[model samples]
Target chain A: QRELLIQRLRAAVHYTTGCLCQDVAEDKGVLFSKQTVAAISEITFRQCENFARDLEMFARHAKRSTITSEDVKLLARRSNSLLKYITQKSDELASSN
Target chain B: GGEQRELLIQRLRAAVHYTTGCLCQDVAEDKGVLFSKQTVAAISEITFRQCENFARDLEMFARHAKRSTITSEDVKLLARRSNSLLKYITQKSDELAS
Candidate 1:
């Protein structure tokens, strides 16, 4: 299961950044640390899992089967950056379709 | 219903204050800055909720590990589930032990 999680993380990282380099070492210019990648993957997976669980809880609280932007907004209300990002993403999502 | 909501808010406020005391002091010491009430409140709410979920999962981990008590190892396992947190906790624990 964790291996699958790491694979998914690697795929996501590649998809998002077009590379898997964890950092750009000043002397080396570019460095790909497997340890760093693994650490980041684990953290990202845990946070996403936690966020999904909370999002579902919020959706269920509202008596809805589906999670919505409103649920995310409510969940992210505490973080200004996150709230702004989520709002922008919600708008983009709303208009994309 | 309103009372329950109010109580929850109070509980959340307490949690936020406690967390802010710990975090803000470190930030202030390192960066010489203070966290705004709104910022603290937001962080507190998110962290409190996260802690709640973590506690639930920790219990599950303990049960799975066949331990009635949650030890540092259980926490280490939980931290390992997250890369950054694992790194952070491992560093902190090492510092404390040393």
Candidate 2:
């Protein structure tokens, strides 16, 4: 399970950075060490978990069993960019649905 | 100020004991020998320092969220910062609640 989590994290970093390169190379390309990848993965996981918990709290505060996009917006209020992005995505989702 | 420091120390000691007791039990179960008093004391000191830092952070988290009360979700978020610690805390909390 631990190995799988690390692999999943590596995949995320790979996708996010748009760099398929894994190890240090002689060419001019991005290089990510195992330790660096692990650290980034750990931080990303924690931030996501914290966001999820806060969203759940926001939903519960509104006496809702389901978390709405508004709950996410409330949780992201600390960051203007994040709030805008979430609101935009939520609108797109709503329109699509 | 001295009295407040003393009270904080007392609370930290209790927190250390609770954490270390749980850790020691796992070790004893696996190794068949308990941690020595000196070992536990050393660990307690380290745990106390970490808890002090964590408490400050928790207070900051609550302040930023405009909440006066620190809920379990706040604690869980803090614990999630450390992957292994998150697992341990969640497991223990679930066990206790059950």
Candidate 3:
């Protein structure tokens, strides 16, 4: 059952990727090669799995019950641009609530 | 269409957010990961945005091949930077074959 959630989750990601690709493709007038859809979808699926694991480890290592966007910033540390984006968006969300 | 696409985009974002949290909770409970709702939303935003970049690259790579269609071959090329990822792609590629 735990595994099923992810299985369906991957499907959701795959479908989302496909739909987004279609949105882009229509604008660009390009077509996705046959397995390329699967390829990108697979990559994103794997990426999300890692995201879950890494973010959790960030929280767990600090002995925290809930993950803060600070924990997210740590995970985003690898990419300067991504890190900046997180903080900007992170800041926006903070002020809204 | 813009309105329709925006709604679709929102749902897709939620899809990833829900999955990421479900996954974080999968570890040994009490020892597993949990997130602030906002944190999950933040992670989801980061992920989907990264994926948008990944999509653009796929488009460019496919265009270079002049087919106007992105191939698994191009996917192979795009992921070349990380062997860890490349290896998983290969492994996933294998699993599909079997």
Candidate 4:
């Protein structure tokens, strides 16, 4: 189920971020800035909230009333999906140089 | 007046004592309460009741569908209906006693 897939993505984000926080607290002075944690947490929360909202919206639009990828994408944008966005940003930065 | 207040205080203290056990296992640990290992039977009981309710809810929704195969979509609709039924039942029961 896509719900299960979304859950796995959330777990990966939480695990990675939690480890980063732990490592920073244990050794480094600052592995992640407070702003970074705040941004990531807000992104995750919005993504989950939007995902549910998207499912409801899609059900209304489709008339058949079942969830689809439209629901998945409509859910808040995945920060992990930002890999492509980051690449695009880097390219733009390089082009300017 | 003092006696009535003292009785109310006693009842409140009893309620606080009862509620201390209501926290989930992790919260209980944080409070220094040792969590007893949950038996497989206990877990199975919860799972079984939930699954039974889920199945019944799906069956109700399937009456509206052409095909009988219960989909997740059917389950969600059924669950919402079941919640309202449960809420109604709870209110009626509470009113009957109270």
Q: Which candidate comes out best when scored by TM-score?
A: 3
Clashing pairs in 4: A51-A75
Candidate 3 chain B lDDT trough over 10 residues, lowest sum: B58-67
- What stretches of model 1 exceed 4 Å from their correct place? A1-97, B1-12, B32-34, B82-84, B91-98
Stretches > 4 Å off in candidate 3: A26-29, B1-98
lDDT (10s digit) by residue, model 4, range B1-98: 79998897667554543444354454766887655545333543454446555665455445434437766555445334256865665566566768
Worst 10 residues of 3 chain A by lDDT: A54-63
Error of 3 at A80 (Å): 1.4
- Against the true two-chain complex, what DockQ does each candidate achieve? 0.03, 0.06, 0.02, 0.04
Across residues A43-78, which tens digit of lDDT does each residue of candidate 2 receive? 666677677776676666546778887777666665
lDDT of 3 by residue, A1-97 (tens): 9899989988999999999889888999999974898899999988876777656655654466677877777657657799799989889989997
- Compose the digit string of candidate 3's lDDT tens values, residues B1-98: 69999999989988988887776566436676556777767877888889876787566545534557776765665556577997889778767758
Clashing pairs in 3: none
| TM-score against truth, every candidate | 0.40, 0.40, 0.45, 0.24
Candidate 2 lDDT, B28-71, residue by residue in tens: 88999978878887887888778666786566556545678886
TM-score of chain B of each: 0.65, 0.63, 0.78, 0.38
Which CAPRI tier for candidate 2?
A: incorrect
